[PDB]
Design a protein around this ligand. Structure first.
Ligand SMILES: CCC(=O)c1ccc(F)c([C@@H]2C[C@@H]2NC(=O)Nc2ccc(Br)cn2)c1O
Lengths: 542, 399
């Protein structure tokens, strides 16, 4: 059939006109196939014979392939078919579910009478045709089809609030909490409703009846999981092999808690041949091992119960890696996940924990429409001390502590006031812009003054290297005075991990100390003390 | 009435901004409002043939229970700029900032009475999303003047003038200013008189259909950069001092530090108080107390607001067109984001009263955090431009 549904007005882009592509010559074999095919279609009304616009038609093994590249580029834009895809964990438990697939979706929907002329094509030796329904490779078919299928369904939905329907392309997923008996009844009432609108649908060939495989998942009426993951177990591994493995693992991490892929992803670093063998390292070996362990016994997820709250827990595992579970009833996980994004060059566990909470909160809004309550391995005290002193505004939804080691904590605090009886280190650093030669030194109030030479360094680095010096030849308590806002900023953010080799070194020293105080004064302003150091640090090599 | 034709800045196309995900309560809120706005023909469903989109949100009236609909037309406003700014601009009265009292009244509902040019409606499409993307998503477009669009007040300007004429003629000293959805009404009357005058104005508005939240501009003064008064002055305390003064030297011409800058000791060491230093210190703070000489407002340039978190519920901010050349500075004083959202509305409001335009904000926060929570505490009908910054150790400076 051809749905008796109003058509969607469609036009071409602004200053453009219909396509006028030349029909390249075909062989007798192909020309005959097209004629048999088009005739068959002509009888059902899908196309009509015409007597100015052209689009090339091909034929391959016998199917008709219309190349709509020209028309598609000249066809207006449509609003996206979907903002996202439903996540299983967000689905409600369902008693009966069946899948109906629409017979000839596109061909059963009329095409705006005024646009058909642009879909004109020809069969060489010429016979000319144009479309009356939505063409296969056309840019507006998916949008107009879904849009049309939604109007067709409204009337039925209204009359059946008890019936849930999800349209995904060609298929229709119909679920309800009714009995398989009264459910199938209702299904038929629906097929008939669709038939009254030009849409044919299976009789008893209903691919229906879960277990259902969809989007990489396997949904049962009582639960869901991802489709069977199977790790190869090869003797050698090519870049391509690792990439496939990392993909499956990441896919499994939605419900299999604790999946880890940091060691494996490390190998894929550095532009490298897709078919090249990459020897696995011990760490990658162990990681691949742990994962195999996790994957041996099947894990399933539960469906959402709108009436209960969401509880999200976040565990720390390894550095920069976070795992989390979201459940409603203790340990019957709805969904699972992991966070690892670095985000910046220098950061600490509290910042990282706050980011993960952000990911989960957003993810939660999308899936369930509400934020969960968190259980974090951090003390209200550690959090409060960090929220208060950090310059950046930070928030975090209702949470509670949960003693699940490794607990999160700050690894060192910077005094707010100068330490008394502590040696003051005035540090500075210079560097010649052409020779890259530098000198990182310091001068204290106790008369000590060291000045090491550096090779191939930036001006920022000597400033960072100078602070590293003051921390080495220093006691457990020290007051440091720098003129580097750059250094100040990094350190004042209390990072506990960095991509800078020097910064990570400075962190080790900072953790060992028991009292450190940083201060800043302007550079080259002869500030009492900074000048003295500046004197020997810039003497030559600048 | 005959609709006014609207054009986009040639070369620019309609908005295609994605809809940020909403929480359940906000979605239910939105379908009730949209369902009711449809029956009344104010908006009408649209299909996929409309490629445009503008995000929508749901806020709480004025801290009440009634959910108000809020549309983010920041994009569409930008692509309509010359139309509402030059073609049909609305003059901003210099006197308003002077007035002893200013009342802000919401006249937004008044726009749903004027129809929108049929050729411009497509650009106002918005989408009500669904939880977990389980249903396609309801799409609509406006048939009448939408509220967060700056074109609305420009067009309705003709009617507002006839409606206010009588009241204006009778009260020559009351200043009325319109700014996208709100009416600013200022007077120098004693509060009672003022509040009474506001009531009388509402009565005029009641006809046509189309204490109310009061501001006191005249009691708005700059936040000076502060220098400790101390009485001790350690080596550290005077280094911090010399540092801050060093800053205020690239701004506030005249700030002298020389006769102080010259005062390898330990940070703990306290030091004697210098002669002229006392004089200089005093003369420095004598300035920094009054506007940076030389800085003026350029009506053709953007205004931008920067906010620093001073900890313990304290936020400082500055408004400027060129970095460090402050037109105004101030302060504000339990979620960090709630305070921040509060400060942003205060600053925007002051900014509208004073210059007649909103400033672009440099927000000391993570993008994802702000975008997830700002609507949670927002209550104004406009939405300012904003970018996210990493506050430099310029928080000590205070400006
Ligand atoms: C198998 C895919 C599927 O059925 C499906 C996918 C996405 C989607 F949004 C829906 C509709 C929401 C309604 N389904 C559900 O709420 N739950 C549900 C439970 C078990 C099974 Br099997 C299918 N659906 C679906 O029914």
């Amino acid at each position: 059939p051809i749905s008796p549904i109003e058509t969607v007005p469609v036009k071409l882009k602004p200053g453009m006109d219909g396509p006028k592509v030349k029909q390249w010559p075909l062989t007798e074999e192909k020309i005959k196939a097209l004629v048999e095919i088009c005739t068959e279609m002509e009888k059902e009304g899908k196309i009509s014979k015409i007597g100015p616009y052209n689009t090339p038609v091909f034929a391959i093994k016998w199917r008709k392939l219309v190349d709509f590249r020209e028309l598609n580029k000249r066809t207006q834009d449509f609003w996206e078919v979907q903002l996202g895809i439903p996540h299983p964990a967000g689905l409600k438990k369902k008693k009966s579910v069946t899948v109906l697939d629409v017979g000839d979706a596109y061909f059963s929907v009329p095409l705006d009478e005024d646009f058909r002329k642009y879909t004109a094509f020809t069969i060489p030796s010429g016979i000319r045709y144009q479309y009356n329904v939505l063409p296969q490779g056309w840019k507006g078919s998916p949008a107009i089809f879904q849009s049309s299928m939604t109007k067709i369904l409204e009337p039925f939905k209204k009359q059946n609030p008890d019936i849930v329907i999800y349209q995904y392309m060609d298929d229709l997923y119909v679920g309800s909490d009714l009995e398989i008996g009264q459910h199938r009844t209702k299904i038929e009432e629906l097929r008939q409703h669709l038939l009254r609108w030009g849409l044919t649908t299976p009789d008893k060939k209903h691919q229906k009846e879960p277990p259902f495989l969809w989007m990489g998942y396997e949904l049962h009426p009582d639960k869901w999981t991802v489709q069977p993951i199977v790790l190869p177990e090869k003797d050698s591994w090519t870049v391509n092999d690792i990439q496939k493995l990392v993909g499956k693992l990441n896919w499994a991490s939605q419900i299999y808690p604790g999946i880890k892929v940091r060691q494996l992803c490390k190998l894929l670093r550095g532009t490298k041949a897709l078919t090249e063998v990459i020897p696995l390292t011990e760490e990658a070996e162990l990681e691949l091992a742990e994962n195999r362990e996790i994957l041996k016994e099947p894990v399933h997820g539960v469906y959402y119960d709108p009436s209960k709250d969401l509880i999200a827990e976040i565990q720390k595992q390894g550095q920069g890696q976070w795992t989390y579970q979201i459940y409603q009833e203790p340990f019957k996980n709805l969904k699972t996940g992991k966070y690892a994004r670095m985000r910046g060059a220098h950061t600490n566990d509290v910042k990282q924990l706050t980011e993960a909470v952000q990911k989960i909160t957003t993810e939660s809004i999308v899936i369930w429409g509400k934020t969960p309550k968190f259980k974090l391995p951090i003390q209200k005290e550690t959090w409060e001390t960090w929220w208060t002193e950090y310059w950046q505004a930070t928030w975090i939804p209702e949470w509670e502590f949960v003693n699940t080691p490794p607990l999160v904590k700050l690894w060192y605090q910077l005094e707010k006031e100068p330490i008394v009886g502590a040696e003051t280190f005035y540090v500075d650093g210079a560097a010649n812009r052409e020779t890259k030669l530098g000198k990182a030194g310091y001068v204290t109030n106790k008369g000590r003054q060291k000045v090491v030479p550096l090779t191939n360094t930036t001006n920022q680095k000597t400033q960072l290297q100078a602070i590293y010096l003051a921390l080495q030849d220093s006691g457990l308590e020290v007051n440091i005075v720098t003129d580097s806002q750059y250094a100040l900023g990094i350190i004042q953010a209390q990072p506990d991990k960095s991509e800078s080799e020097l910064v990570n070194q400075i962190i080790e020293q900072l953790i060992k100390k028991e009292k450190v105080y940083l201060a800043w004064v302007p550079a080259h302003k002869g500030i009492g003390g900074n000048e003295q150091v500046d004197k020997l640090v810039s003497a030559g090599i600048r | 009435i005959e609709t006014v034709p609207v054009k986009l800045k040639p070369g620019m196309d309609g908005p295609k901004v994605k809809q940020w995900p909403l929480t359940e309560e906000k979605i239910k809120a939105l379908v009730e409002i949209c369902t009711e706005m449809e029956k009344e023909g104010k908006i009408s469903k649209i299909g996929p043939e409309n490629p445009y989109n503008t995000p929508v949100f749901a806020i709480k009236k004025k801290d009440s229970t009634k959910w108000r609909k809020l549309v983010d037309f920041r994009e569409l406003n930008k692509r309509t700029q010359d139309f509402w700014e030059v073609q049909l601009g609305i003059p901003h009265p210099a006197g308003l900032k002077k007035k002893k009292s200013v009342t802000v009244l919401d006249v937004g509902d008044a726009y749903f009475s004027v129809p929108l040019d049929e050729d411009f409606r497509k650009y106002t499409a918005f989408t009500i999303p669904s939880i977990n993307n389980e249903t396609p998503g309801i799409r609509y477009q406006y048939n009448v003047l939408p509220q967060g669009w700056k074109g609305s007040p420009a067009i309705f300007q003709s009617s507002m003038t006839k409606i206010l004429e009588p009241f204006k003629k009778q009260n020559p000293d009351i200043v009325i200013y319109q700014y996208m959805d709100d009416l600013y009404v200022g007077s120098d009357l004693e509060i009672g008189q003022h509040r009474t005058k506001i009531e009388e104005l509402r009565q005029h508005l009641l006809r046509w259909g189309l204490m109310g939240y009061e501001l006191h501009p005249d009691k708005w003064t700059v936040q000076p950069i502060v220098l400790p008064e101390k009485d001790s002055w350690t080596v550290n305390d005077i280094q911090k001092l010399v540092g801050k003064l060093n800053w205020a030297s690239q701004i506030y011409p005249g700030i002298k530090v020389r006769q102080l800058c010259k005062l390898t000791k330990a940070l703990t060491e306290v030091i004697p108080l210098t002669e002229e230093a006392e004089l200089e210190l005093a003369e420095n703070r004598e300035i920094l107390k009054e506007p940076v000489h030389g800085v003026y407002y350029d009506p053709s340039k953007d205004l931008i607001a920067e906010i620093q978190k001073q900890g313990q519920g304290q936020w400082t901010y500055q408004i400027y067109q060129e970095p460090f050349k402050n037109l105004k500075t101030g302060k504000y004083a339990t979620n960090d984001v709630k305070q921040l959202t509060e400060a942003v509305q205060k600053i925007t409001t002051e900014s509208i009263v004073i210059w007649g335009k909103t400033p672009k904000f440099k927000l000391p926060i993570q993008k994802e955090t702000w975008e997830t929570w700002w609507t949670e505490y927002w209550q104004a009908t406009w939405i300012p431009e904003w970018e996210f910054v990493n506050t430099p150790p310029l928080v000590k400076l205070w400006y």
